[PDB]
Enzyme design. Structure first.
Site, mmCIF file in Angstrom:
data_model
loop_
_atom_site.group_PDB
_atom_site.id
_atom_site.type_symbol
_atom_site.label_atom_id
_atom_site.label_comp_id
_atom_site.label_asym_id
_atom_site.label_seq_id
_atom_site.Cartn_x
_atom_site.Cartn_y
_atom_site.Cartn_z
ATOM 1 N N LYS A 121 64.299 52.186 34.233
ATOM 2 C CA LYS A 121 64.776 51.240 33.216
ATOM 3 C C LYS A 121 64.774 50.065 34.346
ATOM 4 C CE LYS A 121 66.982 53.481 29.580
ATOM 5 N NZ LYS A 121 68.401 53.551 28.730
ATOM 6 N N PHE B 263 64.870 63.450 35.127
ATOM 7 C CA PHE B 263 64.514 63.749 34.063
ATOM 8 C C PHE B 263 65.290 65.183 33.613
ATOM 9 C CE2 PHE B 263 61.057 63.717 30.570
ATOM 10 C CZ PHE B 263 60.865 62.615 30.724
ATOM 11 N N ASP C 71 76.997 51.126 21.345
ATOM 12 C CA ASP C 71 75.946 51.456 20.904
ATOM 13 C C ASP C 71 75.777 53.304 20.698
ATOM 14 O OD1 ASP C 71 73.182 51.171 19.812
ATOM 15 O OD2 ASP C 71 72.109 51.323 21.646
HETATM 16 N N1 LIG Z 1 66.750 61.323 31.648
HETATM 17 C C1 LIG Z 1 66.110 61.631 30.463
HETATM 18 N N2 LIG Z 1 65.286 62.620 30.585
HETATM 19 C C2 LIG Z 1 64.462 62.898 29.692
HETATM 20 N N3 LIG Z 1 64.456 62.483 28.353
HETATM 21 C C3 LIG Z 1 65.484 61.440 28.128
HETATM 22 C C4 LIG Z 1 66.324 61.023 29.257
HETATM 23 N N4 LIG Z 1 66.943 59.698 28.815
HETATM 24 C C5 LIG Z 1 66.514 59.711 27.386
HETATM 25 N N5 LIG Z 1 65.688 60.578 27.071
HETATM 26 C C6 LIG Z 1 65.135 60.667 25.677
HETATM 27 O O1 LIG Z 1 64.629 59.443 25.248
HETATM 28 C C7 LIG Z 1 65.381 58.815 24.143
HETATM 29 C C8 LIG Z 1 65.774 57.466 24.215
HETATM 30 O O2 LIG Z 1 66.076 57.005 25.449
HETATM 31 P P1 LIG Z 1 67.243 55.936 25.673
HETATM 32 O O3 LIG Z 1 67.830 56.138 27.184
HETATM 33 O O4 LIG Z 1 67.999 56.034 24.462
HETATM 34 O O5 LIG Z 1 66.512 54.688 25.430
HETATM 35 P P2 LIG Z 1 67.027 53.602 24.657
HETATM 36 O O6 LIG Z 1 68.385 53.455 25.065
HETATM 37 O O7 LIG Z 1 66.016 52.358 24.979
HETATM 38 O O8 LIG Z 1 66.503 54.095 23.170
HETATM 39 C C9 LIG Z 1 66.330 59.983 24.040
HETATM 40 O O9 LIG Z 1 66.543 60.305 22.394
HETATM 41 C C10 LIG Z 1 66.213 61.031 24.779
HETATM 42 O O10 LIG Z 1 66.016 62.262 24.135
HETATM 43 MN MN LIG Z 2 70.308 51.830 24.443
#
Ligand SMILES: Nc1ncnc2c1ncn2[C@@H]1O[C@H](COP(=O)(O)OP(=O)(O)O)[C@@H](O)[C@H]1O
Ligand SMILES: [Mn+2]
Ligand SMILES: *[C@@H]1O[C@H](CO)[C@@H](O[C@@H]2O[C@H](CO)[C@@H](O[C@H]3O[C@H](CO)[C@@H](O)[C@H](O)[C@@H]3O)[C@H](O)[C@H]2NC(C)=O)[C@H](O)[C@H]1NC(C)=O
Ligand SMILES: *[C@@H]1O[C@H](CO)[C@@H](O[C@@H]2O[C@H](CO)[C@@H](O)[C@H](O)[C@H]2NC(C)=O)[C@H](O)[C@H]1NC(C)=O
Ligand SMILES: [Mn+2]
Ligand code: NI
Length: 419
Positions: free
Chosen positions: A123, A228, A297
């Site tokens: 990010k 991940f 959030d």
């Molecule tokens: N570290 C990670 N590894 C794998 N998948 C992830 C990870 N972080 C988030 N995700 C997947 O990505 C989706 C959205 O990521 P998120 O962090 O919520 O981004 P945003 O906040 O922009 O929505 C989540 O529903 C999750 O399933």
């Molecule tokens: Mn978010």
């Protein structure tokens, strides 16, 4: 510039992060002492986790990813800080093989594929550490802060939860590590600003556009790097709607739980998933975390569904919208504690000691954050904010006791007499 350089590459702030005034309430402190000094916490902590086993022992180590995955526990994402620090260091230093646009959320984020074919979530940094959210912005309008992701992981450890996902800061060469390593459709979204800074639009639902492009100064760009999660096929996950989800609309801005004090008693304690187990205790834990950081959030929970016949726990994820305001405490976030009035006994003790020594929580967080290569992670103004929010939590704990008994609050497992 709205998008400044990574602070680590800027002039070192030598100011005392703790030269601010905070003096904890001693009346509240002693009263929280009497009703719990005779509680056998030792017996309680041993019941908070039914069975503590990892995935490796359940499924019956070349790199720090694999050892992390194998050591994912049934009541915790990780134990053993030293290997995580090794994983963090690896996340910061491993060479990048591929960069792909991440499929999932709504705000700009990449998936890093390293030379060793392991992966991470990236990010990008946007604004500086001092930036505060527009007061006119709803929770769903705030741009995510990469440094909040880092800060919360460390705080999640400091609180002894260890249910957050390992995240480290990292400054990228946008040319060599991002652009040249990027998939073609991502590659074409790169461009130069009039200031000759290197920028990318990427593609996503939430403001991946030219106007809100991520830009270096000119060619470096800090970001959060988060390991991940293990593969979905191997370690499947559950996606659950929160009973304390906000409305996410500007018209009807008040959910039931925001207006009805009996929400917990009537609407969640009586629900199938929450009437028995650890889920509600998890919810209280996470809203304590969310309140300290001002994260509004929390609409969904993410949990592993791999430890069969064991209760799952919510993964402390998505902290990008935390630490947006240093001068505002959203008492709505800590509402589940006040409404439900149950609290994991280890959390109480962990919460205790920190409160009994003013500035200890924020001090215990700072040195932890300091080991992150991208430090300073948080602007220091957030430190007094977290101490103050901690104090309110303690006061709110005291309120839960006399109304809904002290032996009824501190439970290692929750059971509703009526389900
Ligand atoms: N570290 C990670 N590894 C794998 N998948 C992830 C990870 N972080 C988030 N995700 C997947 O990505 C989706 C959205 O990521 P998120 O962090 O919520 O981004 P945003 O906040 O922009 O929505 C989540 O529903 C999750 O399933
Ligand atoms: Mn978010
Ligand atoms: C479930 O099992 C987990 C694995 O045993 C578990 O782990 C242990 O937790 C303690 C908590 O601090 C760690 O502790 C300490 O000792 C190390 C060794 O030098 C120090 O570096 C630390 O600072 C700390 O003092 C252990 O390392 C950890 N064991 C390992 C190696 O994984 C959980 O506590 C168990 N249950 C829970 C509460 O989830
Ligand atoms: C990103 O990488 C490039 C090189 O790949 C950086 O710079 C070089 O700096 C030397 C200094 O003598 C110049 O002579 C070269 O022209 C540059 N190389 C090229 C081809 O760009 C740049 O500084 C790096 N930026 C960061 C912060 O990582
Ligand atoms: Mn999300
Ligand atoms: Ni804008």
């Amino acid at each position: 510039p709205h998008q400044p350089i990574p602070p680590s590459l800027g002039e070192k702030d030598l100011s005392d992060p703790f030269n601010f005034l905070f003096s904890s309430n001693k009346i509240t402190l002693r009263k929280l002492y009497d009703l719990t000094k005779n509680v056998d916490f030792d017996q309680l902590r041993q019941n908070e986790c039914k069975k503590n086993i990892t995935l490796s022992k359940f499924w019956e180590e070349d790199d720090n990813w694999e050892r992390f995955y194998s050591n994912i526990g049934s009541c915790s994402v990780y134990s053993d800080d030293q290997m995580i620090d090794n994983l963090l260091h690896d996340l910061n230093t491993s060479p990048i093989k591929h960069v792909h646009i991440m499929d999932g959320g709504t705000q700009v984020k990449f998936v890093f594929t390293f030379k060793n074919d392991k992966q991470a979530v990236f990010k990008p940094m946007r604004f500086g550490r001092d930036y505060e959210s527009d007061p006119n912005h709803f929770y769903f309008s705030d741009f995510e802060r990469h440094h909040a992701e880092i800060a919360t992981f460390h705080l999640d450890r400091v609180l002894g939860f260890r249910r957050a996902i390992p995240t480290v800061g990292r400054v990228l060469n946008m040319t060599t590590e991002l652009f040249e390593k990027a998939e073609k459709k991502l590659k074409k979204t790169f461009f130069f600003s009039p200031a000759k800074n290197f920028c990318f639009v990427s593609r996503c639902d939430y403001y991946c556009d030219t106007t809100h492009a991520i830009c270096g100064l000119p060619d470096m760009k800090e970001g959060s790097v988060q390991v991940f999660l293990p593969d979905e096929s191997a370690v499947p996950r559950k996606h659950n709607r929160s009973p304390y989800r906000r409305t996410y609309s500007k018209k009807n801005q008040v959910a039931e739980w925001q207006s009805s004090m009996n929400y917990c008693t009537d609407k969640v304690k009586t629900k199938r998933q929450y009437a028995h187990g650890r889920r509600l205790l998890d919810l209280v834990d996470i809203h304590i975390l969310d309140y300290l950081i001002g994260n509004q959030d929390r609409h969904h929970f993410e949990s592993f569904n791999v430890f069969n016949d064991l209760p799952s726990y919510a993964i402390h994820l998505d902290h990008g919208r935390a630490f947006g305001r240093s001068d505002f405490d959203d008492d709505d976030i800590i509402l589940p504690l006040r409404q439900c009035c149950i609290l994991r006994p280890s959390t109480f003790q962990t919460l205790m000691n920190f409160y009994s020594t003013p500035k200890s929580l924020t001090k215990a967080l700072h040195e932890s954050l300091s080991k992150d290569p991208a430090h300073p992670i948080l602007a220091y103004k957030h430190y007094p904010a977290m101490e103050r929010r901690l104090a309110k939590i303690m006061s709110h704990i005291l309120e839960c006791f006399e109304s809904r008994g002290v032996a009824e609050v501190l439970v290692a497992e929750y059971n509703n007499p009526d389900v």
